[PDB]
Amino acid sequence: GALTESQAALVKSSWEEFNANIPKHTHRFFILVLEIAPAAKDLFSFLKGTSEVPQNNPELQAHAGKVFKLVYEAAIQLEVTGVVVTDATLKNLGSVHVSKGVADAHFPVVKEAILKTIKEVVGAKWSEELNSAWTIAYDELAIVIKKEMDDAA
Ligand code: HEM
Ligand SMILES: [C-]#N
């Protein structure tokens, strides 16, 4: 699909829609995660010892926000420039994932959790053209972090 001026326009628009509700979209995101894979719970410091996913935990919200911002930034960067740029941040990211016991097969878990989360976020405006646009942008960013993990291991 590439990322036409028209496709980028579509990702920006849908991300703005996500940020518009962090405590919701972020708790939803962790539930979609634990749906696709329950065992994942022991990983998160703020999930351990708990029985259910905390709904107003600042640690949790700050965490999941950061995750979606990163995927959006990635899509624009693709339309403008044609690529995703690796920086200091993406590299520190890669370190912390390894400390915490995270692997590559974990990644389609967090992807589907995000496509599903955005399908839920844009509702009827959903198009093939848009699905195609977020899919392209995750894939392209995941490719970059997995790259930094393997490097932190
Ligand atoms: C493109 C995809 C992904 C993005 C953009 C992303 C982003 C992030 C960010 C920004 C942090 C916090 C770093 C800090 O400031 O110290 C983090 C922490 C973490 N991530 Fe991810 N991540 C991705 C995929 C995954 C996957 C697939 C898993 C496995 C389920 C995972 C598990 C964790 C855990 C356990 C922590 C530590 C949280 C703690 O105990 O406090 N991440 N991630
Ligand atoms: C990352 N969650």
mmCIF file with all atom_site columns, C-alpha atoms and ligand atoms in Angstrom:
data_model
loop_
_atom_site.group_PDB
_atom_site.id
_atom_site.type_symbol
_atom_site.label_atom_id
_atom_site.label_alt_id
_atom_site.label_comp_id
_atom_site.label_asym_id
_atom_site.label_entity_id
_atom_site.label_seq_id
_atom_site.pdbx_PDB_ins_code
_atom_site.Cartn_x
_atom_site.Cartn_y
_atom_site.Cartn_z
_atom_site.occupancy
_atom_site.B_iso_or_equiv
_atom_site.pdbx_formal_charge
_atom_site.auth_seq_id
_atom_site.auth_comp_id
_atom_site.auth_asym_id
_atom_site.auth_atom_id
_atom_site.pdbx_PDB_model_num
ATOM   1   C  CA  . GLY A 1 1   ? 0.000   0.000   0.000  1.00 0.00 ? 1   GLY A CA  1
ATOM   2   C  CA  . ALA A 1 2   ? 3.073   2.110   0.589  1.00 0.00 ? 2   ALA A CA  1
ATOM   3   C  CA  . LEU A 1 3   ? 1.791   4.850   2.673  1.00 0.00 ? 3   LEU A CA  1
ATOM   4   C  CA  . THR A 1 4   ? 0.171   7.423   0.223  1.00 0.00 ? 4   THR A CA  1
ATOM   5   C  CA  . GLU A 1 5   ? -0.629  10.810  1.347  1.00 0.00 ? 5   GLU A CA  1
ATOM   6   C  CA  . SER A 1 6   ? -4.012  9.484   1.666  1.00 0.00 ? 6   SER A CA  1
ATOM   7   C  CA  . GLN A 1 7   ? -3.020  6.427   3.957  1.00 0.00 ? 7   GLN A CA  1
ATOM   8   C  CA  . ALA A 1 8   ? -1.002  8.672   6.406  1.00 0.00 ? 8   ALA A CA  1
ATOM   9   C  CA  . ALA A 1 9   ? -3.780  10.917  6.629  1.00 0.00 ? 9   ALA A CA  1
ATOM   10  C  CA  . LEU A 1 10  ? -5.766  7.906   7.751  1.00 0.00 ? 10  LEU A CA  1
ATOM   11  C  CA  . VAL A 1 11  ? -3.257  6.838   10.669 1.00 0.00 ? 11  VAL A CA  1
ATOM   12  C  CA  . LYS A 1 12  ? -2.976  10.323  12.054 1.00 0.00 ? 12  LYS A CA  1
ATOM   13  C  CA  . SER A 1 13  ? -6.529  10.697  12.148 1.00 0.00 ? 13  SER A CA  1
ATOM   14  C  CA  . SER A 1 14  ? -7.084  7.315   14.011 1.00 0.00 ? 14  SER A CA  1
ATOM   15  C  CA  . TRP A 1 15  ? -4.258  7.993   16.621 1.00 0.00 ? 15  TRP A CA  1
ATOM   16  C  CA  . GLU A 1 16  ? -5.714  11.175  17.538 1.00 0.00 ? 16  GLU A CA  1
ATOM   17  C  CA  . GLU A 1 17  ? -8.777  9.226   18.193 1.00 0.00 ? 17  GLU A CA  1
ATOM   18  C  CA  . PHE A 1 18  ? -6.829  6.799   20.658 1.00 0.00 ? 18  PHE A CA  1
ATOM   19  C  CA  . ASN A 1 19  ? -5.152  9.521   22.759 1.00 0.00 ? 19  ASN A CA  1
ATOM   20  C  CA  . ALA A 1 20  ? -8.359  10.957  23.232 1.00 0.00 ? 20  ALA A CA  1
ATOM   21  C  CA  . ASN A 1 21  ? -8.996  8.229   26.017 1.00 0.00 ? 21  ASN A CA  1
ATOM   22  C  CA  . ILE A 1 22  ? -5.901  6.834   27.716 1.00 0.00 ? 22  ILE A CA  1
ATOM   23  C  CA  . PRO A 1 23  ? -7.322  5.184   31.016 1.00 0.00 ? 23  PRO A CA  1
ATOM   24  C  CA  . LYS A 1 24  ? -9.839  3.287   28.743 1.00 0.00 ? 24  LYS A CA  1
ATOM   25  C  CA  . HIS A 1 25  ? -7.924  2.412   25.707 1.00 0.00 ? 25  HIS A CA  1
ATOM   26  C  CA  . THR A 1 26  ? -4.868  1.432   27.893 1.00 0.00 ? 26  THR A CA  1
ATOM   27  C  CA  . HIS A 1 27  ? -6.662  -0.886  30.376 1.00 0.00 ? 27  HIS A CA  1
ATOM   28  C  CA  . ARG A 1 28  ? -8.394  -2.423  27.141 1.00 0.00 ? 28  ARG A CA  1
ATOM   29  C  CA  . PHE A 1 29  ? -5.237  -2.926  25.539 1.00 0.00 ? 29  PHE A CA  1
ATOM   30  C  CA  . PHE A 1 30  ? -3.964  -5.063  28.796 1.00 0.00 ? 30  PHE A CA  1
ATOM   31  C  CA  . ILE A 1 31  ? -7.100  -7.043  28.837 1.00 0.00 ? 31  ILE A CA  1
ATOM   32  C  CA  . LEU A 1 32  ? -6.704  -7.856  25.009 1.00 0.00 ? 32  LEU A CA  1
ATOM   33  C  CA  . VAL A 1 33  ? -3.264  -8.845  25.900 1.00 0.00 ? 33  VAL A CA  1
ATOM   34  C  CA  . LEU A 1 34  ? -4.220  -11.270 28.841 1.00 0.00 ? 34  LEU A CA  1
ATOM   35  C  CA  . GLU A 1 35  ? -6.976  -12.638 26.390 1.00 0.00 ? 35  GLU A CA  1
ATOM   36  C  CA  . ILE A 1 36  ? -4.642  -13.580 23.759 1.00 0.00 ? 36  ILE A CA  1
ATOM   37  C  CA  . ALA A 1 37  ? -2.051  -14.846 26.497 1.00 0.00 ? 37  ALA A CA  1
ATOM   38  C  CA  . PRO A 1 38  ? -2.841  -15.106 30.382 1.00 0.00 ? 38  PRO A CA  1
ATOM   39  C  CA  . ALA A 1 39  ? 0.580   -16.106 31.484 1.00 0.00 ? 39  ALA A CA  1
ATOM   40  C  CA  . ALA A 1 40  ? 1.824   -12.641 30.439 1.00 0.00 ? 40  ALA A CA  1
ATOM   41  C  CA  . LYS A 1 41  ? 0.600   -11.250 33.726 1.00 0.00 ? 41  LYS A CA  1
ATOM   42  C  CA  . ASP A 1 42  ? 3.605   -12.264 35.972 1.00 0.00 ? 42  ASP A CA  1
ATOM   43  C  CA  . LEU A 1 43  ? 5.690   -9.997  33.697 1.00 0.00 ? 43  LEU A CA  1
ATOM   44  C  CA  . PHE A 1 44  ? 4.359   -6.708  34.624 1.00 0.00 ? 44  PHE A CA  1
ATOM   45  C  CA  . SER A 1 45  ? 5.426   -5.330  38.258 1.00 0.00 ? 45  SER A CA  1
ATOM   46  C  CA  . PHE A 1 46  ? 2.302   -3.615  38.457 1.00 0.00 ? 46  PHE A CA  1
ATOM   47  C  CA  . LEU A 1 47  ? 0.333   -6.777  37.560 1.00 0.00 ? 47  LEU A CA  1
ATOM   48  C  CA  . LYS A 1 48  ? 2.172   -9.291  40.006 1.00 0.00 ? 48  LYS A CA  1
ATOM   49  C  CA  . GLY A 1 49  ? 0.389   -10.243 43.238 1.00 0.00 ? 49  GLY A CA  1
ATOM   50  C  CA  . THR A 1 50  ? -2.718  -8.658  41.823 1.00 0.00 ? 50  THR A CA  1
ATOM   51  C  CA  . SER A 1 51  ? -5.646  -10.818 40.805 1.00 0.00 ? 51  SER A CA  1
ATOM   52  C  CA  . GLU A 1 52  ? -7.274  -8.429  38.118 1.00 0.00 ? 52  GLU A CA  1
ATOM   53  C  CA  . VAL A 1 53  ? -5.715  -5.725  35.864 1.00 0.00 ? 53  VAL A CA  1
ATOM   54  C  CA  . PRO A 1 54  ? -5.670  -2.531  37.899 1.00 0.00 ? 54  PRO A CA  1
ATOM   55  C  CA  . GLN A 1 55  ? -7.792  0.163   36.207 1.00 0.00 ? 55  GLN A CA  1
ATOM   56  C  CA  . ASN A 1 56  ? -6.331  3.326   37.826 1.00 0.00 ? 56  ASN A CA  1
ATOM   57  C  CA  . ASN A 1 57  ? -2.811  2.551   38.231 1.00 0.00 ? 57  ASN A CA  1
ATOM   58  C  CA  . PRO A 1 58  ? -0.578  5.378   36.984 1.00 0.00 ? 58  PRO A CA  1
ATOM   59  C  CA  . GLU A 1 59  ? 2.144   3.124   36.380 1.00 0.00 ? 59  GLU A CA  1
ATOM   60  C  CA  . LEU A 1 60  ? -0.025  1.027   33.943 1.00 0.00 ? 60  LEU A CA  1
ATOM   61  C  CA  . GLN A 1 61  ? -1.400  4.124   32.037 1.00 0.00 ? 61  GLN A CA  1
ATOM   62  C  CA  . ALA A 1 62  ? 1.829   5.798   31.535 1.00 0.00 ? 62  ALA A CA  1
ATOM   63  C  CA  . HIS A 1 63  ? 3.172   2.638   30.310 1.00 0.00 ? 63  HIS A CA  1
ATOM   64  C  CA  . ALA A 1 64  ? 0.443   1.789   27.556 1.00 0.00 ? 64  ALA A CA  1
ATOM   65  C  CA  . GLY A 1 65  ? 0.374   5.435   26.280 1.00 0.00 ? 65  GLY A CA  1
ATOM   66  C  CA  . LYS A 1 66  ? 3.863   5.356   25.474 1.00 0.00 ? 66  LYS A CA  1
ATOM   67  C  CA  . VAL A 1 67  ? 3.344   2.196   23.429 1.00 0.00 ? 67  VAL A CA  1
ATOM   68  C  CA  . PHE A 1 68  ? 0.700   3.637   20.903 1.00 0.00 ? 68  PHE A CA  1
ATOM   69  C  CA  . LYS A 1 69  ? 2.563   6.879   20.438 1.00 0.00 ? 69  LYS A CA  1
ATOM   70  C  CA  . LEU A 1 70  ? 5.429   5.133   19.266 1.00 0.00 ? 70  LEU A CA  1
ATOM   71  C  CA  . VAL A 1 71  ? 3.427   3.216   16.449 1.00 0.00 ? 71  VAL A CA  1
ATOM   72  C  CA  . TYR A 1 72  ? 1.821   6.404   15.081 1.00 0.00 ? 72  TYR A CA  1
ATOM   73  C  CA  . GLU A 1 73  ? 5.011   8.265   14.922 1.00 0.00 ? 73  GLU A CA  1
ATOM   74  C  CA  . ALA A 1 74  ? 6.299   5.429   13.003 1.00 0.00 ? 74  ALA A CA  1
ATOM   75  C  CA  . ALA A 1 75  ? 3.519   5.669   10.168 1.00 0.00 ? 75  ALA A CA  1
ATOM   76  C  CA  . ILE A 1 76  ? 4.136   9.356   9.456  1.00 0.00 ? 76  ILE A CA  1
ATOM   77  C  CA  . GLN A 1 77  ? 7.665   8.906   9.375  1.00 0.00 ? 77  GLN A CA  1
ATOM   78  C  CA  . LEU A 1 78  ? 6.959   6.232   6.644  1.00 0.00 ? 78  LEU A CA  1
ATOM   79  C  CA  . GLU A 1 79  ? 4.791   8.528   4.349  1.00 0.00 ? 79  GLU A CA  1
ATOM   80  C  CA  . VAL A 1 80  ? 7.110   11.519  4.565  1.00 0.00 ? 80  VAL A CA  1
ATOM   81  C  CA  . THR A 1 81  ? 10.321  9.974   4.435  1.00 0.00 ? 81  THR A CA  1
ATOM   82  C  CA  . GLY A 1 82  ? 9.606   6.482   3.160  1.00 0.00 ? 82  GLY A CA  1
ATOM   83  C  CA  . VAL A 1 83  ? 11.239  4.788   6.509  1.00 0.00 ? 83  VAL A CA  1
ATOM   84  C  CA  . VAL A 1 84  ? 11.181  4.179   10.494 1.00 0.00 ? 84  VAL A CA  1
ATOM   85  C  CA  . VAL A 1 85  ? 14.217  5.882   12.152 1.00 0.00 ? 85  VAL A CA  1
ATOM   86  C  CA  . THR A 1 86  ? 15.982  3.890   15.184 1.00 0.00 ? 86  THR A CA  1
ATOM   87  C  CA  . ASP A 1 87  ? 17.018  6.297   18.079 1.00 0.00 ? 87  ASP A CA  1
ATOM   88  C  CA  . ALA A 1 88  ? 18.322  6.185   21.987 1.00 0.00 ? 88  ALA A CA  1
ATOM   89  C  CA  . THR A 1 89  ? 14.996  5.583   23.160 1.00 0.00 ? 89  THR A CA  1
ATOM   90  C  CA  . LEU A 1 90  ? 14.293  2.560   20.961 1.00 0.00 ? 90  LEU A CA  1
ATOM   91  C  CA  . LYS A 1 91  ? 17.503  1.128   22.087 1.00 0.00 ? 91  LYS A CA  1
ATOM   92  C  CA  . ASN A 1 92  ? 16.783  1.524   25.894 1.00 0.00 ? 92  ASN A CA  1
ATOM   93  C  CA  . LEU A 1 93  ? 13.498  -0.074  25.040 1.00 0.00 ? 93  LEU A CA  1
ATOM   94  C  CA  . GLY A 1 94  ? 15.096  -3.067  23.765 1.00 0.00 ? 94  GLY A CA  1
ATOM   95  C  CA  . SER A 1 95  ? 17.065  -3.427  27.316 1.00 0.00 ? 95  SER A CA  1
ATOM   96  C  CA  . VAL A 1 96  ? 14.265  -3.192  29.575 1.00 0.00 ? 96  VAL A CA  1
ATOM   97  C  CA  . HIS A 1 97  ? 12.371  -5.916  27.590 1.00 0.00 ? 97  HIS A CA  1
ATOM   98  C  CA  . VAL A 1 98  ? 15.059  -8.301  28.093 1.00 0.00 ? 98  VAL A CA  1
ATOM   99  C  CA  . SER A 1 99  ? 15.321  -7.590  32.053 1.00 0.00 ? 99  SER A CA  1
ATOM   100 C  CA  . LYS A 1 100 ? 11.786  -8.348  32.217 1.00 0.00 ? 100 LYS A CA  1
ATOM   101 C  CA  . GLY A 1 101 ? 11.799  -11.739 30.617 1.00 0.00 ? 101 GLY A CA  1
ATOM   102 C  CA  . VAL A 1 102 ? 10.019  -10.654 27.075 1.00 0.00 ? 102 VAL A CA  1
ATOM   103 C  CA  . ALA A 1 103 ? 10.537  -12.686 23.852 1.00 0.00 ? 103 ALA A CA  1
ATOM   104 C  CA  . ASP A 1 104 ? 9.699   -12.189 19.842 1.00 0.00 ? 104 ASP A CA  1
ATOM   105 C  CA  . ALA A 1 105 ? 6.784   -14.502 20.009 1.00 0.00 ? 105 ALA A CA  1
ATOM   106 C  CA  . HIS A 1 106 ? 5.315   -12.151 22.411 1.00 0.00 ? 106 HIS A CA  1
ATOM   107 C  CA  . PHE A 1 107 ? 5.043   -9.420  19.454 1.00 0.00 ? 107 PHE A CA  1
ATOM   108 C  CA  . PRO A 1 108 ? 1.949   -10.733 17.442 1.00 0.00 ? 108 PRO A CA  1
ATOM   109 C  CA  . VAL A 1 109 ? 0.344   -10.699 20.942 1.00 0.00 ? 109 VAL A CA  1
ATOM   110 C  CA  . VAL A 1 110 ? 0.797   -6.984  21.386 1.00 0.00 ? 110 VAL A CA  1
ATOM   111 C  CA  . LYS A 1 111 ? -0.028  -6.428  17.397 1.00 0.00 ? 111 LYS A CA  1
ATOM   112 C  CA  . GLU A 1 112 ? -3.324  -8.031  17.291 1.00 0.00 ? 112 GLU A CA  1
ATOM   113 C  CA  . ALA A 1 113 ? -3.978  -6.384  20.664 1.00 0.00 ? 113 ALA A CA  1
ATOM   114 C  CA  . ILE A 1 114 ? -3.237  -2.970  18.985 1.00 0.00 ? 114 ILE A CA  1
ATOM   115 C  CA  . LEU A 1 115 ? -5.238  -3.663  15.529 1.00 0.00 ? 115 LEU A CA  1
ATOM   116 C  CA  . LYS A 1 116 ? -8.064  -4.847  17.531 1.00 0.00 ? 116 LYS A CA  1
ATOM   117 C  CA  . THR A 1 117 ? -7.719  -1.880  19.916 1.00 0.00 ? 117 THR A CA  1
ATOM   118 C  CA  . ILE A 1 118 ? -7.710  0.613   16.764 1.00 0.00 ? 118 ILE A CA  1
ATOM   119 C  CA  . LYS A 1 119 ? -10.595 -1.240  15.065 1.00 0.00 ? 119 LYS A CA  1
ATOM   120 C  CA  . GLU A 1 120 ? -12.391 -0.587  18.252 1.00 0.00 ? 120 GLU A CA  1
ATOM   121 C  CA  . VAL A 1 121 ? -11.188 3.007   18.483 1.00 0.00 ? 121 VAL A CA  1
ATOM   122 C  CA  . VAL A 1 122 ? -12.296 4.164   14.671 1.00 0.00 ? 122 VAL A CA  1
ATOM   123 C  CA  . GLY A 1 123 ? -15.361 2.068   14.410 1.00 0.00 ? 123 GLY A CA  1
ATOM   124 C  CA  . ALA A 1 124 ? -17.354 2.502   10.838 1.00 0.00 ? 124 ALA A CA  1
ATOM   125 C  CA  . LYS A 1 125 ? -14.657 4.564   9.337  1.00 0.00 ? 125 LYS A CA  1
ATOM   126 C  CA  . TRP A 1 126 ? -12.726 1.473   9.314  1.00 0.00 ? 126 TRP A CA  1
ATOM   127 C  CA  . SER A 1 127 ? -11.434 0.622   5.792  1.00 0.00 ? 127 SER A CA  1
ATOM   128 C  CA  . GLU A 1 128 ? -9.266  -1.767  4.266  1.00 0.00 ? 128 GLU A CA  1
ATOM   129 C  CA  . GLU A 1 129 ? -7.105  1.170   3.331  1.00 0.00 ? 129 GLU A CA  1
ATOM   130 C  CA  . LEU A 1 130 ? -6.736  2.071   7.218  1.00 0.00 ? 130 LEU A CA  1
ATOM   131 C  CA  . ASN A 1 131 ? -6.087  -1.509  8.393  1.00 0.00 ? 131 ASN A CA  1
ATOM   132 C  CA  . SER A 1 132 ? -3.546  -1.688  5.818  1.00 0.00 ? 132 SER A CA  1
ATOM   133 C  CA  . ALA A 1 133 ? -1.982  1.594   6.970  1.00 0.00 ? 133 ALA A CA  1
ATOM   134 C  CA  . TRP A 1 134 ? -1.579  0.514   10.921 1.00 0.00 ? 134 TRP A CA  1
ATOM   135 C  CA  . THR A 1 135 ? -0.513  -2.876  9.943  1.00 0.00 ? 135 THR A CA  1
ATOM   136 C  CA  . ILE A 1 136 ? 2.191   -1.495  7.857  1.00 0.00 ? 136 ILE A CA  1
ATOM   137 C  CA  . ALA A 1 137 ? 3.323   0.987   10.630 1.00 0.00 ? 137 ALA A CA  1
ATOM   138 C  CA  . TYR A 1 138 ? 3.435   -1.745  13.542 1.00 0.00 ? 138 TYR A CA  1
ATOM   139 C  CA  . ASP A 1 139 ? 5.184   -4.182  11.466 1.00 0.00 ? 139 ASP A CA  1
ATOM   140 C  CA  . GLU A 1 140 ? 7.712   -1.613  10.485 1.00 0.00 ? 140 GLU A CA  1
ATOM   141 C  CA  . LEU A 1 141 ? 8.274   -0.446  14.239 1.00 0.00 ? 141 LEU A CA  1
ATOM   142 C  CA  . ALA A 1 142 ? 8.401   -4.037  15.643 1.00 0.00 ? 142 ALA A CA  1
ATOM   143 C  CA  . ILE A 1 143 ? 10.927  -4.842  13.187 1.00 0.00 ? 143 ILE A CA  1
ATOM   144 C  CA  . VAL A 1 144 ? 13.028  -2.054  14.778 1.00 0.00 ? 144 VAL A CA  1
ATOM   145 C  CA  . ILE A 1 145 ? 12.566  -3.042  18.648 1.00 0.00 ? 145 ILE A CA  1
ATOM   146 C  CA  . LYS A 1 146 ? 13.074  -6.710  18.148 1.00 0.00 ? 146 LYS A CA  1
ATOM   147 C  CA  . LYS A 1 147 ? 16.129  -5.624  16.537 1.00 0.00 ? 147 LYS A CA  1
ATOM   148 C  CA  . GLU A 1 148 ? 17.303  -3.710  19.795 1.00 0.00 ? 148 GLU A CA  1
ATOM   149 C  CA  . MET A 1 149 ? 16.314  -6.705  22.126 1.00 0.00 ? 149 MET A CA  1
ATOM   150 C  CA  . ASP A 1 150 ? 18.264  -9.181  20.441 1.00 0.00 ? 150 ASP A CA  1
ATOM   151 C  CA  . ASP A 1 151 ? 20.985  -6.653  20.824 1.00 0.00 ? 151 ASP A CA  1
ATOM   152 C  CA  . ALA A 1 152 ? 20.355  -6.260  24.704 1.00 0.00 ? 152 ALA A CA  1
ATOM   153 C  CA  . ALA A 1 153 ? 20.337  -10.018 25.343 1.00 0.00 ? 153 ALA A CA  1
HETATM 154 C  C1  . HEM B 2 .   ? 6.156   -2.171  18.726 1.00 0.00 ? 1   HEM B C1  1
HETATM 155 C  C2  . HEM B 2 .   ? 5.805   -2.881  19.874 1.00 0.00 ? 1   HEM B C2  1
HETATM 156 C  C3  . HEM B 2 .   ? 6.159   -2.427  21.409 1.00 0.00 ? 1   HEM B C3  1
HETATM 157 C  C4  . HEM B 2 .   ? 6.318   -1.162  21.868 1.00 0.00 ? 1   HEM B C4  1
HETATM 158 C  C5  . HEM B 2 .   ? 6.197   0.176   21.003 1.00 0.00 ? 1   HEM B C5  1
HETATM 159 C  C6  . HEM B 2 .   ? 6.650   -1.270  23.406 1.00 0.00 ? 1   HEM B C6  1
HETATM 160 C  C7  . HEM B 2 .   ? 6.941   -0.208  24.278 1.00 0.00 ? 1   HEM B C7  1
HETATM 161 C  C8  . HEM B 2 .   ? 7.317   -0.284  25.734 1.00 0.00 ? 1   HEM B C8  1
HETATM 162 C  C9  . HEM B 2 .   ? 7.719   0.848   26.593 1.00 0.00 ? 1   HEM B C9  1
HETATM 163 C  C10 . HEM B 2 .   ? 7.745   2.311   26.027 1.00 0.00 ? 1   HEM B C10 1
HETATM 164 C  C11 . HEM B 2 .   ? 8.073   0.361   27.935 1.00 0.00 ? 1   HEM B C11 1
HETATM 165 C  C12 . HEM B 2 .   ? 8.599   1.157   29.224 1.00 0.00 ? 1   HEM B C12 1
HETATM 166 C  C13 . HEM B 2 .   ? 10.035  1.441   29.133 1.00 0.00 ? 1   HEM B C13 1
HETATM 167 C  C14 . HEM B 2 .   ? 10.532  2.332   30.336 1.00 0.00 ? 1   HEM B C14 1
HETATM 168 O  O1  . HEM B 2 .   ? 10.333  3.560   30.224 1.00 0.00 ? 1   HEM B O1  1
HETATM 169 O  O2  . HEM B 2 .   ? 11.309  1.882   31.321 1.00 0.00 ? 1   HEM B O2  1
HETATM 170 C  C15 . HEM B 2 .   ? 7.864   -1.080  27.954 1.00 0.00 ? 1   HEM B C15 1
HETATM 171 C  C16 . HEM B 2 .   ? 8.036   -1.944  29.157 1.00 0.00 ? 1   HEM B C16 1
HETATM 172 C  C17 . HEM B 2 .   ? 7.721   -3.299  29.228 1.00 0.00 ? 1   HEM B C17 1
HETATM 173 N  N1  . HEM B 2 .   ? 7.270   -4.020  28.077 1.00 0.00 ? 1   HEM B N1  1
HETATM 174 FE FE1 . HEM B 2 .   ? 6.842   -3.394  26.004 1.00 0.00 ? 1   HEM B FE1 1
HETATM 175 N  N2  . HEM B 2 .   ? 6.643   -2.589  23.859 1.00 0.00 ? 1   HEM B N2  1
HETATM 176 C  C18 . HEM B 2 .   ? 6.332   -3.333  22.684 1.00 0.00 ? 1   HEM B C18 1
HETATM 177 C  C19 . HEM B 2 .   ? 6.142   -4.717  22.729 1.00 0.00 ? 1   HEM B C19 1
HETATM 178 C  C20 . HEM B 2 .   ? 6.156   -5.568  23.952 1.00 0.00 ? 1   HEM B C20 1
HETATM 179 C  C21 . HEM B 2 .   ? 5.820   -6.988  23.993 1.00 0.00 ? 1   HEM B C21 1
HETATM 180 C  C22 . HEM B 2 .   ? 5.458   -7.808  22.671 1.00 0.00 ? 1   HEM B C22 1
HETATM 181 C  C23 . HEM B 2 .   ? 5.846   -7.411  25.388 1.00 0.00 ? 1   HEM B C23 1
HETATM 182 C  C24 . HEM B 2 .   ? 5.502   -8.810  26.008 1.00 0.00 ? 1   HEM B C24 1
HETATM 183 C  C25 . HEM B 2 .   ? 4.339   -9.073  26.421 1.00 0.00 ? 1   HEM B C25 1
HETATM 184 C  C26 . HEM B 2 .   ? 6.280   -6.285  26.241 1.00 0.00 ? 1   HEM B C26 1
HETATM 185 C  C27 . HEM B 2 .   ? 6.515   -6.319  27.724 1.00 0.00 ? 1   HEM B C27 1
HETATM 186 C  C28 . HEM B 2 .   ? 6.997   -5.293  28.569 1.00 0.00 ? 1   HEM B C28 1
HETATM 187 C  C29 . HEM B 2 .   ? 7.289   -5.386  30.124 1.00 0.00 ? 1   HEM B C29 1
HETATM 188 C  C30 . HEM B 2 .   ? 7.084   -6.639  31.099 1.00 0.00 ? 1   HEM B C30 1
HETATM 189 C  C31 . HEM B 2 .   ? 7.740   -4.175  30.523 1.00 0.00 ? 1   HEM B C31 1
HETATM 190 C  C32 . HEM B 2 .   ? 8.139   -3.767  32.058 1.00 0.00 ? 1   HEM B C32 1
HETATM 191 C  C33 . HEM B 2 .   ? 7.035   -3.116  32.706 1.00 0.00 ? 1   HEM B C33 1
HETATM 192 C  C34 . HEM B 2 .   ? 7.334   -3.133  34.325 1.00 0.00 ? 1   HEM B C34 1
HETATM 193 O  O3  . HEM B 2 .   ? 7.362   -4.232  35.024 1.00 0.00 ? 1   HEM B O3  1
HETATM 194 O  O4  . HEM B 2 .   ? 7.284   -2.079  34.980 1.00 0.00 ? 1   HEM B O4  1
HETATM 195 N  N3  . HEM B 2 .   ? 6.442   -5.192  25.335 1.00 0.00 ? 1   HEM B N3  1
HETATM 196 N  N4  . HEM B 2 .   ? 7.403   -1.432  26.597 1.00 0.00 ? 1   HEM B N4  1
HETATM 197 C  C1  . LIG B 3 .   ? 4.605   -2.975  26.191 1.00 0.00 ? 2   LIG B C1  1
HETATM 198 N  N1  . LIG B 3 .   ? 3.670   -3.183  26.700 1.00 0.00 ? 2   LIG B N1  1
#
